[PDB]
Amino acid sequence: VHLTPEEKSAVTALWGKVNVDEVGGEALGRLLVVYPWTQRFFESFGDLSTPDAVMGNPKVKAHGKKVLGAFSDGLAHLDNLKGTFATLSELHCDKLHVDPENFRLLGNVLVCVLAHHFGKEFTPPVQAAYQKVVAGVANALAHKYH
């Protein structure tokens, strides 16, 4: 993706403050609640029957942490997202057969969670830079569809 040096600084500064224990779990969790059909990919995760159950689910928090780790790796290699997510794309496309639409939803749920956590610090220019990031990640996860 193409981030201005001013955008990269704002992205980096915000990301450095991200609670890596919770933010990923909340993003993945909100995905499962707002878009319930995504739960079908997580049958072995136990109880997803209610919103409270999804958010508090230890397997959701744990897996969400891995999701946030992928975004962290993407930020560290913005010049090669296709190569950085090459393995993850093989998994999500060939094996799991996840619809590319779902990739964009999660990216945007992550945005909402950042907005939720940082409030006014999540300014429109900061959002704009993060939208470039999540679009690039979502696309890099789906090249093996292309």
Binding site: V33, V34, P51, C112, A115, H116, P124, Q127, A128
Partner: protein, 141 residues
């Protein structure tokens, strides 16, 4: 189609916006214009500079329409018929842009009303905006 819970969630949450209609409406528009530049092509005659008086005033119109939509959640097509004619018949806005604005509305609400923006309320607000979006992009008259 909204559940009785969705309707309850939406009225309580959107009810907290209050005098912040113009501000949040405007902010949601600026977030859309900045994050998704292609949406600006629907507003060529507009002053889309940051902090423009035209965008801020338009934000108030959009927010008020949503407030009206909330109040008429059980007869939205009739209530939004004028806005539908504008967006579907005249402007012919691609539905994808309504998804972008809806997403920016959620971001604004999350940034300003963290206590309100629970996962369940997030789900209800998203379904609400999706319904508003479908009505405004459908030619049903």
């Amino acid at each position: 189609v909204l559940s009785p819970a969705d309707k309850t969630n939406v009225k309580a949450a959107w009810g907290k916006v209050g005098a912040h209609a113009g501000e949040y409406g405007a902010e949601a528009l600026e977030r859309m214009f900045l994050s998704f530049p292609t949406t600006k092509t629907y507003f060529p005659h507009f002053d889309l500079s940051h902090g423009s008086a035209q965008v801020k005033g338009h934000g108030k119109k959009v927010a008020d329409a949503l407030t009206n939509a909330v109040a008429h959640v059980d007869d939205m097509p009739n209530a939004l018929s004028a806005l539908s004619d504008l967006h579907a018949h005249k402007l012919r806005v691609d539905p994808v842009n309504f998804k972008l604005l809806s997403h920016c509305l959620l971001v604004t609400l999350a940034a300003h009303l963290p206590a309100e923006f629970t996962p369940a309320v997030h789900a209800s607000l998203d379904k609400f905006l999706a319904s508003v979006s479908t009505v405004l992009t459908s030619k049903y008259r």
